Design a protein around this ligand. Sequence first.
Ligand SMILES: *[C@@H]1O[C@H](CO)[C@@H](O[C@@H]2O[C@H](CO)[C@@H](O[C@@H]3O[C@H](CO[C@H]4O[C@H](CO)[C@@H](O)[C@H](O)[C@@H]4O)[C@@H](O)[C@H](O[C@H]4O[C@H](CO)[C@@H](O)[C@H](O)[C@@H]4O)[C@@H]3O)[C@H](O)[C@H]2NC(C)=O)[C@H](O)[C@H]1NC(C)=O
Ligand SMILES: CC(=O)N[C@H]1[C@H]([C@H](O)[C@H](O)CO)O[C@@](OC[C@H]2O[C@@H](O)[C@H](O)[C@@H](O)[C@H]2O)(C(=O)O)C[C@@H]1O
Length: 306
Amino acid sequence: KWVFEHPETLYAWEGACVWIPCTYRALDGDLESFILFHNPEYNKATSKFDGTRLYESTKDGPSEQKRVQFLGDKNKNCTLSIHPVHLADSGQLGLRMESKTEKWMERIHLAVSERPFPPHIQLPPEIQESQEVTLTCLLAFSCYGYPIQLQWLLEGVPMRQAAVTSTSLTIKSVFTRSELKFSPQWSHHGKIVTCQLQDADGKFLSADTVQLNVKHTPKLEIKVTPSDAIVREGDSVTMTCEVSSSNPEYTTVSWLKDGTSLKKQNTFTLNLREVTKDQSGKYCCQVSNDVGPGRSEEVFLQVQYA
Ligand SMILES: *[C@@H]1O[C@H](CO)[C@@H](O[C@@H]2O[C@H](CO)[C@@H](O[C@@H]3O[C@H](CO[C@H]4O[C@H](CO)[C@@H](O)[C@H](O)[C@@H]4O)[C@@H](O)[C@H](O[C@H]4O[C@H](CO)[C@@H](O)[C@H](O)[C@@H]4O)[C@@H]3O)[C@H](O)[C@H]2NC(C)=O)[C@H](O)[C@H]1NC(C)=O
Ligand SMILES: CC(=O)N[C@H]1[C@H]([C@H](O)[C@H](O)CO)O[C@@](OC[C@H]2O[C@@H](O)[C@H](O)[C@@H](O)[C@H]2O)(C(=O)O)C[C@@H]1O
């Protein structure tokens, strides 16, 4: 029973580095030899592991200027460092360990892409206007030798809101995260948000893009005929209610005169026939969707005597 604790799969790209936190417990006790293979192959005939050796405790254990470094010890630490990492390093890292009475091979998968891979934006399934939402950008990479930055963009412009970067680099998980808190408005709907990955000097590396879907109450434009909203008694007045933006789709419409609802006016058009001076006042329409009700600007109807 050999117990190992490591991220089990590490990601990087050509020219960057990888840092592999690793602890272990050998019930047999202290180690006597350590070999780090790359893509180790097992020889059934000789009962030994063949393949490329990247580190040997007998030979490489040094000059401090070495691409592959073993940073652990013969006890409880198996931390590895490859700086820089190459596409040829991609595959199986085989930690060939031997205790006094037993030998163990612990494999750690290393996935290296030729170019930087994009980050991943995670956002809640329902985003509503005027509620603080945290956008999360997640990159499955973090290495000391290669500092990086995550940059938020809105329609190609750097976003005003401060974003907070945090990095995990543990036996459990390796990532770089950026969280941006902002309250979206109805105008943010349909816009694109970009999370840019940059190196320490701001050089563009990769990016992920999402188009925002922001729920909002209906936004309305009211129009009146005649346009000046001034009529004599007996004339006819027509007011229409137009939905400029609504997410999701609107479901009901109502009309109000001076704060009181006009009964049986449940269409997007209000027709006042043979108007009396009574019907002067302030008019508006209200359109509701699943998010809530919206109201248009008020129209001041002036019915002048005779
Ligand atoms: C197994 O045992 C080993 C040996 O002790 C432990 O190794 C140490 O690991 C820590 C991190 O867990 C290392 O700290 C980090 O080292 C990075 C590499 O720095 C080297 O290169 C720079 C640049 O040339 C040198 O200046 C430096 O002296 C090293 O030679 C740094 O890049 C890191 O910097 C980051 O963190 C520091 C905070 O400490 C910040 O100030 C920085 O801004 C940056 O954010 C950091 O210094 C440490 O160097 C390792 N020690 C050795 C001797 O290698 C393992 O941790 C252990 N494993 C487990 C699982 O316990
Ligand atoms: C404690 C113990 O079981 N040691 C085994 C060791 C472990 O099973 C292995 O390191 C765990 O990953 O395997 C040894 O065999 C490796 C060899 O086993 C074949 O069955 C397999 O087809 C090969 O791919 C290869 O894994 C070892 O020496 O490392 C034997 C040892 O007793």
